[PDB]
Amino acid sequence: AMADLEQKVLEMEASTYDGVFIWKISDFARKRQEAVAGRIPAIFSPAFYTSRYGYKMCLRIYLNGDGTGRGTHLSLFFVVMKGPNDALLRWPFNQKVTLMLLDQNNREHVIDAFRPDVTSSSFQRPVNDMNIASGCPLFCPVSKMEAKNSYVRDDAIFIKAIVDLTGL
């Protein structure tokens, strides 16, 4: 009951309840390197929800790529987690999901969006703490951002997610 409590407070500090989430990844160069080196290929973000008692979700990013994007792109996925109120929610999950890599000059962001594949186990009511993540393996070319550009500034980047609430 020492570090465990901190982890809980940090995740609480990062929670949102309106389907909009902004994830700030610091120490970028290092994490990027640990991915490239295969020691830590992916990282989960803290959890957020569609409403106060809505769906519990988080994101997972591979700084050096997953699947078709391995070694060439930054891969970004959506994760449906086991929420405290899943018994009261409608399943499978079927809300539009938008993902973004924010340009820090706010000129041109990187973006993609999709409607859930309702047949996929990724969107069924969770039995485990988290379902299999799904989203965009070719989200962003490692070259574009990372290198020059204004996506990485003061060794950090901002990832943004927007879960459409139509019907909720």
Partner: peptide
Amino acid sequence: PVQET
């Protein structure tokens, strides 16, 4: 969407 690997 495409599932993670």
